[PDB]
Design a protein around this ligand. Structure first.
Ligand code: MG
Ligand code: MG
Ligand code: MG
Ligand code: MG
Ligand code: MG
Ligand code: MG
Ligand code: MG
Ligand code: MG
Ligand code: MG
Ligand code: MG
Ligand code: MG
Ligand code: MG
Lengths: 100, 205, 51, 144, 203
RNA sequence: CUAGUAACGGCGAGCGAACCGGGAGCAGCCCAGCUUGAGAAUCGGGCGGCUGUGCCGUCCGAAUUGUAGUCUGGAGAGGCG
RNA sequence: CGCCCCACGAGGCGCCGUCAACGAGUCGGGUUGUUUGGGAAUGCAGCCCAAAUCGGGCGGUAGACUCCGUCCAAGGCUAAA
RNA sequence: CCGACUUUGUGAAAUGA
């Protein structure tokens, strides 16, 4: 964003150069899900089913005990960063199966 | 151990006599590299002997941030704005580094002047004999072409030592530069403690 | 059997002298070329060289 | 110069200069610094005080670049300006010195200065460098 | 394009359908020899992405390996030495089982060269890998530019020398920065380099 | 060069790299995946010819559980010039 | 130096905004063992758990939140010094 | 020696939730 302060030490220290906005590259969309891959994954999801711990997540969420849902999801997957979003995804599956 | 001497750090408890590397072949590598350079020059005649063009870039690392050096290649932005296609730039003696990022106009125009200079004093033989297509060069000046030797576009490593003479103004004398220089250090120390009280100022009031 | 403390290739064969000390020594040698008594002492037959 | 080593003069003296009573065996004290805490204790705690133990906190992955502050005392600043642009100057007009162009980050305040004003333009300044430059009539311009 | 479908269906490895088909394949595999020629990949997508082609000369061989660590082969658990090298039962082999399978197939199959190998099925005692082998004397491989590079003599026994996908994994070549700077060109190369006493001429 | 340094070690003996910088040389590439479907456009082998490290014709086979072509993230595919 | 004359195919360049597909018992996590300078764990390996697509790996002290710098693995080839 | 996870699937009852 805006350039350095020009003063060698302190908040936003450094030497002043007129900063520049980088053109969009490939790999800034890296991971942006696409129409067909979403189609594929969603189709295969119910055909395969749900893994047993994911079913336990569904059960704990439909009880509403989100802390233990996250806890067991973390103990299965391994890290909080992915446990959190696995809980989000399974909460999404429960809203999309209590929508109807 | 005995009388006052440094605590030894001899790292010679392994079998170092199996891994001594002697440099008696130093003149030999000098001469072999020289021979290789002659036989590359004759082959790439009449290309420049230093190779393709290299960008002026800054070094990393606070110790050398101000000292410019030759980089690896021009970025895509730079090639595009100097009007030279991606796949053609390495062809005519211009390196390309798709991994660099241009973060400054100061860097971009600095290298764009180099691209323009290289295209200014570049000559390109036709791919065939009589057919002179677009981007080629005329025979009359093709006929004096030579192999430049050494660095054909030198890079100054630091900006020149220049000390002009100027007035000492009253408001320049009043400037407490050390007080200034302590104030932002104080702000950097207190940056968290300030923004926290701001955060709960919003959260409550 | 062996020799005591066998000779090894990683002796200090080449020694280093300061570049400025080489230059000083070449200066003193050039100066000593100019003095007829030094050449004649050093062993050159110079009784008929002009200057 | 083996023709000079004192071993050569010790030829014929049975003990090669290491004594008859206490002979010259392999390692009667141990390899290297053996027994710093035990029997070379007198040596280590007479000539190398502070050898044993931890002091201070660790610093994983230090780069020496992070700690780079080349410094110059005030006394040497005027050597940096050539005599011609010392002449092209008067009481109100003074030369400007970019120490970063000379390779210096901080400007420390040791020594005398001439009464002639000077505008040193640095990245870091001390208290005393500023006090001496101001008292000399110059000024400071902080850049980076 | 079906390979996205089949790849995702192999991503869901704890689903009921995959559990069924993978148990029954595990039984079929356990009833056959350790090294068996198989006509076609069971995982066409996985085979393709590693460089398999429905072309003559690319053969597929299913390899079985036992699981568990490498327990030290010494005459009674007696290891003559200092107490710090005296263990037996919790040592681990420094090559992964994928590599072990490749290095089994490579030895038994002399006239063919190992391209890749991929997991197919697993149980309590045996892992089953499918190893893609390439016949480099076969003209249909001599005439494919994407695979000639494997006919040059410098690619002999890649598996036996640590050059395949599993090879680079267990060599630790998957990484470039710190955490992986010692393993370039090899751990032994860097040890030699760091141990060479450089005695310059004018030292 | 960093550097016998940061770190590691009954923190004892000892052990010990990397970034930055300067040099030598510098070249980047190709796959898999959505994408001929009026139509396997691909490859091998036998036989035959010739100009012969291959090319061509014919007949078998491989292959649709995908050969060839386009693509590789720095992109790319489309449409206009 | 000589005959052979390079297209409606491909590329480059300019614009568009629509798509934009990218490697799984793999990463990643626990524990064990070895190894490292790598220290709440440097690589590797065994066993168990086991993914993600507004995502994933890093930023040398484990932890959660906010922001920022950076790169795109789990397929392959590549002289020169 | 024994404990847990794994190959390890099926349905049934009785006691705890
Ligand atoms: Mg020894
Ligand atoms: Mg005597
Ligand atoms: Mg003596
Ligand atoms: Mg004696
Ligand atoms: Mg004595
Ligand atoms: Mg005695
Ligand atoms: Mg004692
Ligand atoms: Mg030093
Ligand atoms: Mg060691
Ligand atoms: Mg070992
Ligand atoms: Mg470990
Ligand atoms: Mg390779």
């Amino acid at each position: 964003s805006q350039p350095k302060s020009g003063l060698f030490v302190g908040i936003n220290k450094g030497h002043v150069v007129t900063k520049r906005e980088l053109p969009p590259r490939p790999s800034d969309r890296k991971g942006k899900g696409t129409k067909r891959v979403h189609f594929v994954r969603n189709l295969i999801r119910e055909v395969a089913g749900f893994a047993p711990y994911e079913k336990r997540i569904t059960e704990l969420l439909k009880v509403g005990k989100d802390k233990r849902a996250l806890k067991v999801a973390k103990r299965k997957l391994g890290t909080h960063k992915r446990a959190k979003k696995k809980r989000e995804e399974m909460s999404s599956v429960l809203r999309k199966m209590r929508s109807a | 151990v005995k009388h006052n001497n440094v605590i030894p750090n001899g790292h010679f408890k392994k079998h170092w006599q199996n891994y001594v590397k002697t440099w008696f072949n130093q003149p030999a590598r000098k001469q072999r590299r020289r021979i290789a350079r002659q036989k590359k020059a004759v082959k790439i005649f009449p290309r420049p002997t230093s190779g393709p063009l290299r960008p002026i870039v800054q070094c990393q690392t606070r110790k050398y941030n101000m000292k410019a050096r030759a980089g690896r290649g021009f970025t895509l932005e730079e090639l595009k704005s100097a009007g030279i296609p991606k796949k053609l730039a390495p062809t005519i003696g211009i390196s390309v580094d798709h991994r660099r990022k241009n973060r400054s106009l100061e860097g971009m125009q600095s290298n764009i002047q180099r691209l323009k200079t290289y295209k200014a004093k570049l000559v390109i033989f036709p791919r065939r004999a009589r057919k002179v297509k677009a981007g080629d060069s005329t025979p009359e000046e093709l006929a004096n072409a030579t192999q430049v030797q050494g660095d054909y576009m030198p890079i100054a490593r630091g900006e020149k030592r220049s000390v002009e003479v100027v007035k000492v103004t009253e408001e320049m004398k009043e400037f407490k530069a050390y007080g200034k220089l302590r104030v932002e250090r104080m702000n950097q120390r207190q940056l968290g403690a300030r923004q926290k009280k701001a955060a709960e100022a919003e959260k409550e009031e | 059997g062996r020799m005591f403390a066998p000779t090894r290739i990683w002796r200090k064969w080449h020694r280093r002298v300061n570049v400025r000390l080489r230059r000083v020594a070449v200066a003193s040698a050039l100066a000593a070329t100019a003095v007829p008594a030094i050449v004649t002492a050093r062993g050159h037959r110079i009784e008929s060289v002009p200057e | 110069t083996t023709r000079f080593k004192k071993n050569r003069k010790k030829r014929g003296h049975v003990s090669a200069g290491h004594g008859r009573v206490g002979k010259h065996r392999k390692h009667p004290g141990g390899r290297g610094n053996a027994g710093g805490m035990h029997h070379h204790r007198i040596l280590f705690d007479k000539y190398h005080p502070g050898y044993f133990g931890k002091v201070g906190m660790r610093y994983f992955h230090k780069l020496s670049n992070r700690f780079y502050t080349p410094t110059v005392n005030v006394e040497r600043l005027w050597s940096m300006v050539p005599s011609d642009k010392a002449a092209e100057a008067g009481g109100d007009k003074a030369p400007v010195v970019d120490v970063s162009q000379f390779g210096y980050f901080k400007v420390l305040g040791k020594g005398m200065l001439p009464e002639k004003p000077i505008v040193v333009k640095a990245k870091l300044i001390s208290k005393i460098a500023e006090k001496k430059i101001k008292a000399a009539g110059g000024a400071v311009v902080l850049v980076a | 394009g079906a390979y996205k479908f089949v790849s995702e269906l192999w991503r869901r490895k704890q689903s009921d359908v995959m559990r069924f088909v993978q148990r029954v394949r595990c039984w079929e595999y356990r009833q056959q020899p350790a090294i068996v020629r198989i006509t076609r990949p069971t995982r066409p997508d996985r085979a393709r992405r590693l460089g398999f082609k429905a072309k003559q000369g690319y053969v597929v061989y299913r390899i079985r390996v036992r699981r568990g660590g490498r327990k030290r082969p010494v005459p009674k658990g007696i290891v003559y030495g200092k107490p710090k090298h005296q263990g037996i039962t919790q040592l681990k082999f420094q090559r992964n089982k994928r590599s072990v399978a490749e290095e089994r197939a490579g030895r038994r199959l002399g006239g063919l060269r190992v391209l890749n190998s991929y997991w197919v099925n697993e149980d309590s005692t045996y892992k089953y890998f499918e190893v893609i082998l390439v016949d480099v004397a076969h003209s249909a491989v001599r005439n494919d530019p994407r695979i000639n590079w494997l006919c040059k003599p410098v690619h002999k026994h890649r598996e036996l020398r640590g050059l395949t996908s599993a090879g680079k994994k267990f060599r630790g070549l998957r990484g470039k920065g710190h955490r992986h700077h010692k393993n370039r060109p090899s751990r032994r190369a860097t040890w030699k380099r760091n141990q060479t006493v450089s005695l310059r001429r004018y030292r």
